[model samples]
Target: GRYRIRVATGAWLFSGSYNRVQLWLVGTRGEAELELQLRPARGEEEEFDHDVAEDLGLLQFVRLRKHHWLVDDAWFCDRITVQGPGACAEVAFPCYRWVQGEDILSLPEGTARLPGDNALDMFQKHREKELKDRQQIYCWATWKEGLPLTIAADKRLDFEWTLKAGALEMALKRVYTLLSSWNCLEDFDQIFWGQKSALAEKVRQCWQDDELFSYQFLNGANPMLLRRSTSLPSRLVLPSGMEELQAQLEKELQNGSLFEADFILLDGIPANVIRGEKQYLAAPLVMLKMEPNGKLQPMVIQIQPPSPSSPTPTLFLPSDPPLAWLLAKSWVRNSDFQLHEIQYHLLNTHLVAEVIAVATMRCLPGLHPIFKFLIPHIRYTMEINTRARTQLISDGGIFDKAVSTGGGGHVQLLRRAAAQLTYCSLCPPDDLADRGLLGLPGALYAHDALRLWEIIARYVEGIVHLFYQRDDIVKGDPELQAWCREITEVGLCQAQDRGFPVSFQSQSQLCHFLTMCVFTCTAQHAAINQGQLDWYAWVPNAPCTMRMPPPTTKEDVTMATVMGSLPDVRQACLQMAISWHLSRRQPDMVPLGHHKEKYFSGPKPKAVLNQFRTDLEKLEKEITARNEQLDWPYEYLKPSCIENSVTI
Candidate 1:
């Protein structure tokens, strides 16, 4: 509590009754004391010999206030004070309090030693696992041949950033407290001690009460974690359905309707956190450091969190912040548009168009499989548009180039593809459709580009998979058939509400969405969505760093040797090809690597596959009109039904 002080001093007010004022100083540091003594009113005591005051340090001649002296008791004091010896004479002065240096929090200098470092160790170990997993992911990214530029380091790098940040510090403390609270468990209960303890019982009770935090590890190691710090990885979450119920009134209000539908916002994870299993924490961290100006920089970690489990461990590496800032600013300009109404309108229109396309695509007969794939892709595009634009608006245009680099091309490609596919399928085949034969081009294209398509499709699949795996999102696992049903329902509802016509472009868009959804779903299983800040070090089950021999001095290599064999562009391309191939391809191609272990998990994948079939059937119904009405050459739209033999 803080208070204001006002005071006026004069001789008349200074009397025997008011002789001294005491003030207390208090704050987090502690408390201090100070006192002021006053002498009798000067005018009244002028003729009389005031009893000589006993020497009180510097207050022997001090006079009492004619009215009263004000005092403040506070931990921090920057006010002014004054003393006057007078009779009815006014005296005012500012009292400045002595203060220590102001407090300004900052990153702890050097390696901040943790209390026990137990949690830090665990996080480091987990980060190591990310590293190993990342290698495996690279192999997965390039499962097919000749698809250069297909596999990427983006998702892997994102995971690396997760481990570098402190992902498990909070959990470790919670677990330790629980363990300590249950130390009295009996020897016989040791086998089932976790379930037998009071702490366990308390946790169980909370679980039943739904009083626990809803923290979740979605799709695996690449998680959406909650951090207390402003500088940390972000978790995507939607407010509860009940929250929307409360917002109904707001939505009805005239002003509220003007705003775009209430988009998601940043929120804190509630207490009673949901913890993940050891498996969820296992994966390799692939870090990519970039400047704010969109300039690529060497990757490095700063503060590494604890890791009790990790496959490879890394440490922090220094970076150039100015460059990072510049890159970020560029990204902002390119993608951040929330601030400008025109930008918002454009983006919103794009979203509306996508929704229409997806809905329309579901109606196209003979193209259900492609439509299903396209729907998810469209959805993916919408989300990215939302996120990228929203970020630019919120953070300002400074970080545009840094955060949104390389998205322009992707956006254009996606938009063009969506536009062409969403129409009546009359668009030039060279523009959107790949080279395919009449009535049976789908399989040929799939076979020719299976590897590349597989990689992209993984992103869409990862997103959907993560959505389902997040127990906090919606109750019950989604069936593959149900997915198709959801697509149809959402599409139809959107189309009717918007009064948009359905066409072949819509069907193609649906296929794109489905493809993107499955892509994200696949990525989710592989833990490829985490943000990576650095490559040198990681946290959250910290990973071990690779040891590279120190480079030899320049003097060791003669000028002739240094210039003799410069790597050529083709060599670089070849390396890029190798990386691309490694992204989705297995370690061994002749004998397919652990497909079962990687995918086809118990009941889940099967359920999804079944859902796909159901969606295919529903799509067949929606497009019957279009399929039969068409009298032109059957180029984009198949004559009877779309291809279905290709396995998910």
Candidate 2:
């Protein structure tokens, strides 16, 4: 509960003239025992004791605050203790410093040792100093510069940093209890500062509720984990659906009259507790709007909450205090902006672009068989984009250069392709009819996705498959050769310097480089949208690591090596494509409430569908035959689509 102290004067002692010291004790009841003065004389090493219950009215916490001198003076302590009705405890004071505020000076000499070399005191002092000069915690700068350079650089990362930093600030304040609670302090050290063996043992225990503090085997070897427990209390939570509702509301507001909306507070999973058992505090910050019928219903606001199980908890503070500050300042830059505004751009613009692109690509394979060849190629692009950008950053180049001249450019292209295809599908009737042969079954004012697909499929196959052919086959087409040469000399040349070579020695080498650029693009798009840090190491239900290994050689560019590559990207593209195709039809043909209804009710011309399938199947087999001749090791014809893909 509480404790107090007083020291009686003994013999005369002096540091030139007089001696003075201040004493303090903090309690759990928010009580800080005011300063107690002391004066000793020559040959006097003063010692005194006070009855704990007699002075403080309780016997609980009784933590001794860091005692220090007001000026340069000599000080010594033999021992100090508190005695009561049923308890007696020694308060160890190993040393004190000349500094005024910093607490608990030097550690005991090497002669002193705790059992098993705990070094708990060392850790305590370390944390105390860390808190004394609070460092500016921040998010990684790589994402800031990298996201913008990519074509899909909406402000999602900007908003994400705000939300994450807000929660971390709360966690820091709540952890103040550790300073007074020995049990808590010990647990903190064990979780965060303990040796590798200690961490290994705790990881083996497999405590289910301790996700934040528990050990994780990166690549099934290095058991890295966050020292901060999941139970670290936080007061603020960015409500789940707020961003989504705001985006829609803003969009509607732009076109018509005002209305109300209701945004519910869905807990951010990997959720922090408040105090004891309270998992979350619901703050339903809602805004209401009236419907056409005068009945109020919540607007269709959906939120994509912060990821609960991030591989790196201290992603923004990967090192010590000064290093973190330096990185944040240099990399992330000034990120102070209205969060709501950032969220608007993220949800309505950046994320929408990705959704449209990914959805269109994913659903393409099922619409026509030619896309079956394209699926593996799309997935390959994603892997290269994700893995290559990561490698470039690790090489310690400017983040902008890594993403732009590195694999990031490829990612932009993939996203751009998706967007371009989606735009073509939704083109104006007059625009569609002007293409004549590329036109749908409708007259001068009709649109059909199937017809758009026919044209797109031919266009993509012609561009992509050209990489697989020998230079002699298409060397006469100066325009196409010029295009290939430009990309090779600039983009491919830079990639080669960074260890991802696209050798023009043979068609196989040339094909590998061209195709890999697409892979890199696809991978980058997925990583940004999926909110993964080390996306290259990510696998479904598998452990991920920041220390991901680099790809060894060109031959290593296969599906197995790029594990867990395109599940989300594939699914997103498929859904977008389906929605694009369905949205173009009449209401009766594509039902609103029932998703299954749209797939069956569409007036799909079987003649066109059957013909395209037959043509694509023949083309796919021929492409596979060509790949086998060169030593291309990927299953280029597999039509695999991800089930249960994560939508942004």
Candidate 3:
């Protein structure tokens, strides 16, 4: 008898295989050990028939091994399907992974299995031992108490991103030849001469617009802050003859339209010292409102400056001098850059995703249902985060070169922010509801993000319900329980009052949890990171550093005052250099719902995944139409462009 063996190679640069692929088919009745030489055709599937003395009855497993390597090249096997003269159906084995070093990789039948599914006796214990071994490999390591628990791989850590960092940080000597500060307000416009952005160009023109300022807090890089204000801060004084404005503020407050973006985390935090000069970071309390026309606008910007100036906070009103209010907004922007970078961008997205990836790798087996669900969203998370710690966030990195909170400043703010961070704040809906963005109109980020969140949740629910039919099955699974516990206790470092279940009791809960993980690594991260260069393109839009102190009073403000407050040519270029690179997609970028793996190749799971992709494509068209209707279009959360994970 003969068995036709089919193997698939994915579409990548190095998808082909030169190694002699040897395969063995084992089933319930018998085992056929054969060394079949295969070139493993690239970008397609190849078939080879092997002679067997007897029918390999009901082929249950296929063990693949690369006999030889040509210059140590690895082969990416997408799938393996076997058909024989047996009373069983053709077996499909999903092996969408790199094979190297003549190592044996086992692939079970593509049929999805839950905890109590029937399987080979020997493999039952083998599966249990694999997770045990991995658990030790991905052990938890503490970097800071307030920070989320890190894995052994965190100390271990994106290589392609670091390569870009080196290119950006290759300093040019002559760009610094100018005044120690910006020469004029127009100097900021010179930044986009070579660097181009469709949105950033508009930023130079409309960065000072109060509407855009309020819009940024809603849809900008750090959309996490901002809440409906029931009462005004007593310190926030309304200037004389602004009685109508005060009346409107009162009306808005009563009507649930008044909003605030309070940057209390920047208060009392030590500023970073860069270029032999100390920088300033201020905590600003911005009062915004929804006008009768239904647009959010910043009404007042009150800064509690740590600088030793006139002591009380300086208030920037729309009635103030153009440069004075501009300078004040710029200071607030500098603080936004810090919180967006350190807390939301890095800690919330990159760091939190790192822990989830590490815990998943350590606690789950290859055959586990949740592992198949999560593996795509965490590709290069550990690898990319490791590179981040060394080349970006470490001492003397790019952050140190230009940004205000680089050295110890980043450390302090991360600690305080992380300490204040709660489990409720992690999800998009919860964070938005807490910030009153749920009711706030024209929140493009909110509208797009919540839509994507539901889409991912539906995808997760499809898979979850497919494998675990009932609540008892979820609780009975030992591997799944341990994974949940490990993520909370070992990975997140906080289990108390987080509402994060130690163990999943229902299929819906499991789906909800996985949805959060996938959303954070994908769309949530996209909103903050993808728009960096655009937001920071013009230096005044989001300055990396403020050389001058935060304004103490609105009196005696000048163009020179604002110019000196913004960064110099060298620092501004450095800021632009980093943002430009970080904002870009990598050469091998994989967008949301665009997976190259065959983990879900089983019939039911395959349909689930295909439906997920279909929904994403539909979302692509929908959001594209939505962006066309807005002046300040937000294209970051579009599913077509969002990376599947934090590979950057």
* Per-residue alpha-carbon lDDT of candidate 2 for residues 4-26, written as tens digits (9 for 90 to 100): 24232322233454333434332
What candidate 3 gets wrong by more than 4 Å, as runs, is 10-18, 68-71, 86-90, 117-123, 153-172, 178-181, 233-248, 305-311
Candidate with more favorable, higher TM-score: 1 or 3: 3
Model 3 weakest 10-residue run by lDDT? 153-162
Rank candidates by lDDT, best first. 3, 2, 1
In candidate 2, position 122 carries an lDDT of 39
What does candidate 3's lDDT look like per residue over 1-648, in tens digits?
778888887633333444466788988788888776656444657788887887666777888876664644666778888878754466788777776556687777666555555455635654666577667767777766767776554321234435655554455335654434457888766556555677877887888887777778887777877777868866566666667768867877898889988888888787778768888778888888888776888877887733455444667887788788988888888888888898888988888899889888887777787888888999889777767776787777667767888867787888887776666677777778777777555888888888888898889998989888899999898878888887787677765456666889998888888988899889888887887867777778888888888877787778888888888777788888778767765678888888877676567777888888888888888889988988888888888788999887
Q: 356-446 in candidate 1: lDDT tens per residue?
A: 3333232321112233233322323333333333432122221211111112322332233223232212111221232221122212222
Each candidate: RMSD: 32.8, 34.3, 3.4
CA lDDT, every prediction?
0.24, 0.26, 0.77
Q: Which candidate has the highest TM-score of all? A: 3
Superposition-based RMSD of candidate 2 using all C-alpha atoms, in angstroms: 34.3
TM-score for candidate 1, please give it. 0.19
Evaluate residue 47 in candidate 1 and report its C-alpha lDDT on the 0 to 100 scale.
Answer: 16
